[PDB]
């Protein structure tokens, strides 16, 4: 039965009991219900009026905090002689919540989630520290971040005609500004995102287990807009995500063992307890040993 | 125009802020809602569900063996069976539970707890136990005539399989506080102990050794505050395949 | 004056913003409106008009030949004539159509489609065809007794020149999604196939070979969202005479 709850529950005064056919401390765990025994039935209580609030454990408050989701560093310079794998004054990132463990464990407390996502972008710069360079001051560069849908075409170079952004949303911002900010709506083809997915998202037998591309929000494509200077710099970009307007379903057992990979739930555990595969809690000498026992002298 | 001036705090980014911000996709229509079973709206709903205590946290117990306590017939009266530390912030038998895991995202707590025990011997096995809670102030009791002076229940094995011990909220202050100090007057909860009230008595065709499973939950007088990063997870490196998000 | 402070996002330029801004020419009077035929107010009005499919996208078909399918009399029963892939985001027979071109400025889509076919043989020519739509899950059907288990219409040539096949919206999710993956459970639509129901039968003075033109449109249950730059146009250089704008 649903009700509105703003504070913790009050306690009522209680008397001696001695009554045949009545046993409120006995229960049947096999049914799958939790024990309904109340304090007034177990001991003699006083009256207490309880004013403790419950708002800091609301689901919106628990999940709606900006958390780090990407950190990328790259060199801002003339890239004419760089190797094929290098980020040449720009990079691509696929938006995900799988890479930094504090946000990942919190989202994985639930089976399905529906939210809008507030995105904040923070940029910092430093002079390259090779022995040819003195310090010189730091440039106030312009950057472009372009939103591109999951699987769509992305730019191939810093000066590509793809950056013309004729229908894609782009945000232009300077290092001297406050951090850039925008909101992405709930974009799923379904009524909620799947946090876990027990299946194969293709009609043939061959691909990966447990990844549904309908839960991938999109891509950010990021460049420096300025031409290269005569000297090199290192630029670092950090992205933060805050979920808002949240609904959540079907709570789950928390992650115990360390994460191995962004792609799956694979496990190994620590070498010794705590959080080892064969022992989650740290050991004590026996079930009769009290570990922080008070000594009086 | 309007005359204005800037305050201290202008242009800062605070991770707990709450403001509107520019929509990326104008005129976008999100997918219709439909009903889904099992919606949750306050984390105190999860904390009220029973989950298993790891009471047998000992070097020789492997995997699932850590989740049960074995008992057998004794030839001396009044004997101690086991004890449990109660500090819900620290590592110990209570930590990897629904109430333990959620509480470790917060710093202050208040309210009553319940422990429930299930007997898993044969139908022909009989016995009586006494379960005691001792409020703080000195050392954990080692004898039945010391422990029975505290809060307790006497349990008879029978057609009902299970019994509940209430741990009532008994504290000087409104909340207890997560220091990293188990012996603080703002943190310590006291002790739980279990003794034989009679003996475990079984016939020759039953197993001579029987097991208990112990469970814990919060009551609906429980509350949590001052949120923090959980100590139960962390990393020293990027995960495997993390570079693939940049490809 | 008024005490104020600046938020994160201050001074940024977002290309999808919506604000008032300073007029260059004060007291300017724009030219009076007059009525002009053919006003359009939503791009879903254009998407509902029929346009020709390029079904004959083969190496030996040149220019206008790609827009028709030729059929002739056969000496075996039940034979396959042609098939059409249905993925409205990808390159293929549907791409260069009013519905295809407008849909490729967006990323998500939903709703029913219609295909209409016109027979262009002589008045003295006769025949019957079967047109089938197969929902996704495995390989495209190669035989009439497999294909007829799906959604279909049987078409008789006669005084009415043309027939419509409805492709109904049948999807697990509210929208389908433009990945760059044709075999995704969020993208694949299934198949259209055409077979002989009888045979093409003509007299000696008619042409022995006759042609079909195929058309496609959306119904008024159709919708599009999440706008993007179109993949159908691009440049690697400035156009000819582009420097003349600076002279």
């Amino acid at each position: 039965i649903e009700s509105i709850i703003k504070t913790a529950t009050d306690t009522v005064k209680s008397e001696i009991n001695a009554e045949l056919g009545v046993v409120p401390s006995l229960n049947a765990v096999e049914t799958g219900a939790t024990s309904n025994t109340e304090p007034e039935e177990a001991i003699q209580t006083r009256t207490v009026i309880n004013q403790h609030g419950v708002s800091e454990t609301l689901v919106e408050n628990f999940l709606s905090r900006a958390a780090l989701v990407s950190k990328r560093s790259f060199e801002y310079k003339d890239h004419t002689s760089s190797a094929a794998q290098t980020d040449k004054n720009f990079f691509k990132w696929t938006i995900n919540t799988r890479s930094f463990v504090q946000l990942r464990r919190k989202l994985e407390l639930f089976t399905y989630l529906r939210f809008d996502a507030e995105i904040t972008i923070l940029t910092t710069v430093a002079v390259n520290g090779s022995s040819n360079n003195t310090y010189v001051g730091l440039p106030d560069l312009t950057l472009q971040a372009m939103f591109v849908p999951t699987g769509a075409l992305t730019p191939e170079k810093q000066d590509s005609f793809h950056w013309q952004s004729g229908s894609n949303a782009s945000v232009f911002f300077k290092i001297s500004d406050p951090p850039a900010r925008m909101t992405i709506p709930f974009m799923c083809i379904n009524s909620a995102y799947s946090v876990f997915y027990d299946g194969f998202a293709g009609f043939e037998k061959s691909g990966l287990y447990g990844i549904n591309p309908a839960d991938t929000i999109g891509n950010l494509c990021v460049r420096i807009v300025n031409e290269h200077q005569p000297v090199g710099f290192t630029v670092t970009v950090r992205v933060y995500m805050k979920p808002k307007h949240i609904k959540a379903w079907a709570p789950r057992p928390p992650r115990t063992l360390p994460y191995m990979s962004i792609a799956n739930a694979n496990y190994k555990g620590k070498g010794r307890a705590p959080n080892a595969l064969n022992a989650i809690i740290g050991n004590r000498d026996s079930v009769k040993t009290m570990p922080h026992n008070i000594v009086t002298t | 125009g309007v005359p204005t001036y800037l305050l201290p705090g202008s242009g800062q980014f605070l991770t707990t802020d709450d403001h509107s911000s520019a929509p990326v996709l104008p005129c976008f229509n999100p997918t219709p809602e439909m009903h889904i079973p099992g919606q949750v709206r306050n984390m105190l709903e999860v904390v009220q569900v029973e989950s298993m205590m790891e009471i047998n946290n000992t070097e020789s117990a492997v995997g699932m063996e850590r989740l049960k306590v074995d008992i057998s017939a004794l030839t001396d009266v009044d004997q101690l069976l086991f004890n449990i530390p109660l500090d819900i912030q620290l590592d110990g038998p209570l930590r990897n539970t629904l109430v333990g895991n959620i509480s470790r995202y917060y710093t202050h707590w208040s309210g009553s707890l319940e422990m429930t025990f299930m007997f898993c011997g044969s139908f022909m096995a009989t016995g009586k136990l006494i379960l005691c809670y001792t409020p703080p102030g000195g050392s954990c009791p080692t004898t039945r005539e010391t422990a029975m002076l505290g809060t307790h229940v006497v349990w008879d094995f029978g057609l009902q399989s299970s019994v509940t011990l209430i741990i009532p909220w008994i504290s000087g202050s409104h909340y207890r506080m997560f220091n990293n100090d188990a012996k603080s007057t703002n943190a310590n909860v006291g002790y739980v102990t279990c003794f034989m009230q009679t003996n475990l008595i079984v016939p020759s065709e039953s197993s001579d050794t029987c097991s208990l499973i112990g469970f814990i939950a919060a009551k609906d007088d429980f509350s949590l505050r001052l949120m923090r990063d959980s100590p139960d997870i962390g990393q020293l490196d990027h995960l495997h395949a993390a570079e693939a998000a940049y490809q | 004056g008024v005490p104020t402070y600046l938020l994160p996002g201050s001074g940024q330029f977002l290309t999808t913003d919506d604000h008032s801004s300073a007029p260059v020419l004060p007291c300017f009077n724009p030219t009076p409106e007059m009525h002009i035929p053919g006003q359009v107010r939503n791009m879903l009005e254009v998407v509902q008009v029929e346009s020709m499919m390029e079904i004959n996208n083969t190496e030996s078909a040149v220019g206008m030949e790609r827009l028709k399918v030729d059929i002739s009399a056969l000496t075996d029963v039940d034979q396959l004539l042609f098939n059409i892939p249905l993925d409205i985001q990808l390159d293929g027979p549907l791409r260069n159509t009013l519905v295809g071109n407008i849909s490729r400025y967006y990323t998500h889509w939903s709703g029913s489609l219609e295909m209409t076919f016109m027979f262009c043989g002589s008045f003295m020519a006769t025949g019957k065809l079967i047109l089938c739509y197969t929902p996704p899950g495995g390989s495209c059907p190669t035989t009439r007794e497999t294909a007829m288990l799906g959604t279909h219409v049987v078409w008789d040539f006669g005084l009415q020149s043309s027939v419509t096949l409805i492709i109904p919206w049948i999807s697990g999710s509210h929208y389908r999604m433009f990945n760059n993956d044709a075999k995704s459970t969020n993208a694949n639509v299934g198949y259209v196939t055409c077979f002989m129901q009888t045979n093409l039968i003509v007299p000696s003075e008619s042409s022995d070979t006759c042609s079909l033109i195929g058309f496609i449109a959306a119904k008024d249950d159709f919708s599009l969202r999440l706008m993007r730059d179109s993949p159908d146009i691009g440049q690697l250089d400035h156009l000819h005479a582009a420097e003349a704008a600076y002279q």
Partner: peptide, 9 residues
């Protein structure tokens, strides 16, 4: 990449 396509290279 695997997050966009659920295929391994």
């Amino acid at each position: 990449n695997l997050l966009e396509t659920r295929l391994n290279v």
